[PDB]
RNA sequence: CUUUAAUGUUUGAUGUUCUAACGUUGACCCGUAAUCCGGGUUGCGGACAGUGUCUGGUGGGUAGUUUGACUGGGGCGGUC
RNA sequence: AAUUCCUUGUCGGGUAAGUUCCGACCUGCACGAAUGGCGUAAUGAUGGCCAGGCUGUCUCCACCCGAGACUCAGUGAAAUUGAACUCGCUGUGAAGAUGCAGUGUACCCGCGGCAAGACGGAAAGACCCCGUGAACCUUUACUAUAGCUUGACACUGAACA
RNA sequence: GCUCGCCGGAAGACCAAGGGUUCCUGUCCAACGUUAAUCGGGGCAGGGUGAGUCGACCCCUAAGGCGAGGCCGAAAGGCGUAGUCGAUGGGAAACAGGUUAAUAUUCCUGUACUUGGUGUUACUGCGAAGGGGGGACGGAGAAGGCUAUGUUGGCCGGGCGACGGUUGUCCCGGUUUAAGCGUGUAGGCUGGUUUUCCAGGCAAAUCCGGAAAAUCAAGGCUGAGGCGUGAUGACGAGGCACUACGGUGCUGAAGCAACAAAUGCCCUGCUUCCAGGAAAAGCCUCUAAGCAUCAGGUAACAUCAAAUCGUACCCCAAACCGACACAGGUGGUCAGGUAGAGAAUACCAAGGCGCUUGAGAGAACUCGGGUGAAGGAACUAGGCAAAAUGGUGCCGUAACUUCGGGAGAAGGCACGCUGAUAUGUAGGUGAGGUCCCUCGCGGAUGGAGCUGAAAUCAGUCGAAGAUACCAGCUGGCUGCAACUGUUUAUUAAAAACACAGCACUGUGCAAACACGAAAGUGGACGUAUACGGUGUGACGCCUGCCCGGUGCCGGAAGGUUAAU
RNA sequence: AGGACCGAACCGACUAAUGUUGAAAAAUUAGCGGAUGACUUGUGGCUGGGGGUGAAAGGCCAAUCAAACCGGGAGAUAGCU
RNA sequence: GAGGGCGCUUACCACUUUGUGAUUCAUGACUGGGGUGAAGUCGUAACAAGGUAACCGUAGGGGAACCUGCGGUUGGAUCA
RNA sequence: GCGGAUUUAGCUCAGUUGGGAGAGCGCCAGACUGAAGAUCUGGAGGUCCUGUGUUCGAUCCACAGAAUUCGCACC
């Protein structure tokens, strides 16, 4: 019901957290496709 | 419950004549020696006992073994136990402990509480029954010879001690006379505390199952993805056993390890 | 040379139990102000357990399929 | 009662009228012991007409402050598509006349009435089968795998009776 | 100016969802405000939100991450002790004044404190990884005080107050008293002080549990706050100037007591009921070692360290989300006001600020209703809509026993505004004056200053007075789920049935279930009167009866004929 | 005392009424309760595919899940105009 | 100056009903109780051992005709 | 409509190789009863649907007809 595209940090250590992109294999390949051959950036760290 | 002192219920000026009406045996604080159970059923993952309701556990006893036999003790004050309907005791040994001992009908003076290797034979902490008498009542009894008792309440069970039985190897309870363990197994006498809490329902509902469980209500009935029936229409009507595993009579066992049961006379 | 006995000499089994297997989810002792956990006196039952297939039905507790056609549209009643 | 097998069965009392406000001779197939039965506590997240209220609920709403929408200024996008200059029973049948002509002969425009008139739109019609067919739940049909279950050789010995 | 509005559980307050610095002004129109457009966080030029104490490191953890060695493991990966992470659990720990657009426990300005080094005097036997006090809860409450804040006037600043009236009995405006120290009061807890010994407390023990004497009864630990200390510390009616018209420059009245209630203070008081309110710590002390003419800790006062953030806009909710300043959601937070049963409702002062589509027109186009002559549902799937009836109390009311309840049943009714008892009754209140006492937060006499029912005798004005917003059909019927219901949000709104007892059933117990490959975690801190089958259909009776078939299984007298 | 009778925002979900050419895969206006709990109520880590908690629903579960928001099997089968 | 005539005040109080019940009539819409016994039929245990009894409170099978099992007080034949 | 059953003793229906027509029961006698039944031994009781055929012999089957009756065809 409580519809939907919210910031915060804190949900992030299961789903969309940056070290756990590169501790996956799974998010691995995705984050050289996406900056380090992807010719590009992310920087949103914060 | 024709009992005393027996609290019966009320006249009808309210939706509720039970609860049990028992004044004079709650108490607080909860005592320095004190512990809880913890989150919900977990197994890790996929739970078999179903319909949960997991919150309140919560506090518990704590007092297990109570192998202190020999050092007399006293009776402090008697409460009660919501996880067993329990008629425990605080005892003061003498020594300088204080402790929780399962009590009688109204155990109090605050009486001579002792036992010992043939030295006492008095309602006695735990005590071996192959040095004191013979009779219906006998309480604790380890279930089997160090474990630790068999039974944590005083609801009525009487366990009934025989003689000299194919040489000390003893007890006749309910649902197999041909225990045989041994009298080198530990009493304390004797099985009739509250039978006033269980003897007679608390409510339709009540406290004690509505605050922090659900009961079981359901298995059958509704939704055909769980059980053995079936299409619809509110008909049911069919044979639906409880399967692969059964009902109404078979027996379960065959082999175990100590395995004592013998006869088995059943129904 | 046997219907058969007593024994020797060749040998299988079932009862009958004792028991260093074993299991200790039982204690005492013990490394240890110790929930895991190491190891022994002891206590317990006991060749029991464990599962690998073979024989057996037991239930609709995964999955599966919708198996011709003939239709003055179907279910029956008829045929290649 | 979801049996009323028979038909809206009744005696007819009450009643401007009893296809019932029930007012106790039944015509009972396919009635019930835990898929139970003789019954009921005060509560209405109250189901079905029946009194007297109040009345405009009929037939009778013709007066109204009045939202606005056609109007006057800002602004004007698609649920997507048959050219129109689209005859008001029309007739005749690749069985339906706003176009195969027998008639009347409707000036150009309000998109203002907009009452039958893109059979229309919200969209693989629900009736739905040619379906070498998505899987979709069952039952003393069909079963199968996981399983339930014991007895069996594998495995773990003979000393005596 | 002048007359009024919206939010009225305020878009009052500070800040936590990180989105982040787009608030004030100086100035502006695309990159936008479906109108003007001056305003909108739009958007641009400046700058900015001052924290030793706010909260999170800490020492700390219930759940839950990981984890030595390991039981294991196809390669994967699973479960776990000691440890170590760990708050939304705990502990020490900002107020009155002033001052910058802001932004403010900070800034200043003083009071004076918490953790830890150091110094000069002083006192004293200390210590831990172990012991014990509790360290610790849950809400309804009950009872006494403090008054928050208001209204009043003594008292003070203004004066008799533009229409008609008003020149001592009127009518306005401040009505502040900060600190930490000082002490102790409200209920409460507990009779005081020594000596001698244990079947006890991880080895011990001046501390705890139990015992055994001695000598005494008035003993021990505070607590809202009254009260006071500070304070010739100030705030401020007003007076006199100056101006960058914001202010700041010079100076300055008055300054007492009553009366009534909290949303809050005391009360981890004290009560009442049980689902049974979680652990390491501070608070307070016991020793173990090992020091042991040494070292430690507690005290007056002297100092230094005060360990990277964040602090900006913003909320019972427009830069979150919805995505069109969206008829979704939805907060811990100061509780603003009198009459009110009420976060029941038209009314408020403020803070943002009246919310950037409104001019005329006045056919039919039902987002509708009202009082209808008649009649009273004569309408119809929906007395649907429009209601009306909605107090205490009474002149007094029916079937029915589960003797609660069916009973604010039902019925209709005096109700406005005030004489008189009564220059206000009663009831609530307790100044002083006067006396006593233990000496001080003490009591006895006493009637000052506020307040305010409830009726009785008598009035009389209605078409109307509970003259207004809150808030109800007696019924009486059918089938009794018998516990309120909210439980299938998605046809039904229950006409569903979740109760809950029990004969029987699975476990004599490494129990029944196995989810994870190795768990033994539910049940268990537990026994067949614990927990589960399949249900039960209030309560209470009553379950008659009848074994063909067909189940439920059990067994072995005995054949169908197997792995063996 | 009682899941009391009758009380607020913390509850859902009866038929309509202005909800369908949406403020809207849902919420509405004068109305109206369950009145302290068979309540719902919020930071986050344990339910991660054919799911997994059961007031026990075919509804959920992103809003339209009898397996979808996956794109890697695969530009599959193809009696298919 | 005073009443009574009135004219206000208000009641005892006739109409009237919120109500619902006493009890008396026929319209008695599933029936079952105590009998005569114009020929009733199925049955038939008891008034003697009504020809292998059972009376009595009676609980129960259920054509009861109540069988039938205690406890007597012999209103039930003896030399059991 | 087709296909089945059935027309066998008062009652209830058994039976058929296809050569005999049955019993549970009711009557009759027999005696036991004054009598009657029980029970009893004896004895009896027939549209074996009709027609035609097969056949040694048809109650029976096959076939044509008649008639009672049932399941399905109908929607």
Not at chain 2, 18 to 40: C, D, I, Q, T, V
């Amino acid at each position: 019901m409580k519809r939907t595209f919210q910031p915060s940090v804190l949900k992030r250590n299961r789903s969309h957290g940056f070290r756990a992109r590169m501790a996956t294999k799974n998010g691995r390949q995705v984050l050289a496709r996406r900056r380090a051959k992807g010719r590009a950036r992310l920087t949103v760290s914060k | 419950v024709k009992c005393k002192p027996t609290s019966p219920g009320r006249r009808h000026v309210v939706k509720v004549v039970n609860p049990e009406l028992h004044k004079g045996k709650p108490f607080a604080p909860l005592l320095e020696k004190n512990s809880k159970s913890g989150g919900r059923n977990n197994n890790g993952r996929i739970t078999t006992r179903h319909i949960g309701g997991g919150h309140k556990q919560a506090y518990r006893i704590v007092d297990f073994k109570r192998n202190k036999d020999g050092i007399p003790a006293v009776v402090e004050r008697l409460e009660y136990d919501p996880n067993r309907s329990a008629n425990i005791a605080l005892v003061l040994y003498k020594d300088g402990e204080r402790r929780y001992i399962l009590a009688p009908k109204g155990l109090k003076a605050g009486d001579q509480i002792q036992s010992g290797v043939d030295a006492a034979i008095k309602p006695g902490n735990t005590l071996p029954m192959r040095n004191i008498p013979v009779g219906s009542t006998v309480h604790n009894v380890e279930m089997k010879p160090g474990k630790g008792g068999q039974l944590a309440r005083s609801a009525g069970t009487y366990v009934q001690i025989v003689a000299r039985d194919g040489a000390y190897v003893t007890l006749r309870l309910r649902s197999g006379e041909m225990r045989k363990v041994e009298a080198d197994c530990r009493a304390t006498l004797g099985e009739v505390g509250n039978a006033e809490h269980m003897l007679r329902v608390l409510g339709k509902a009540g406290a004690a199952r509505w605050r922090g469980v659900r009961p079981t209500v359901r298995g059958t009935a509704m939704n055909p993805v769980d059980h053995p029936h079936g299409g619809g229409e509110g008909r049911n009507f069919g044979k639906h056993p409880v399967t692969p595993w059964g009902v109404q009579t078979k027996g379960k066992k065959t082999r175990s390890n100590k395995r004592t049961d013998k006869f088995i006379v059943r129904r």
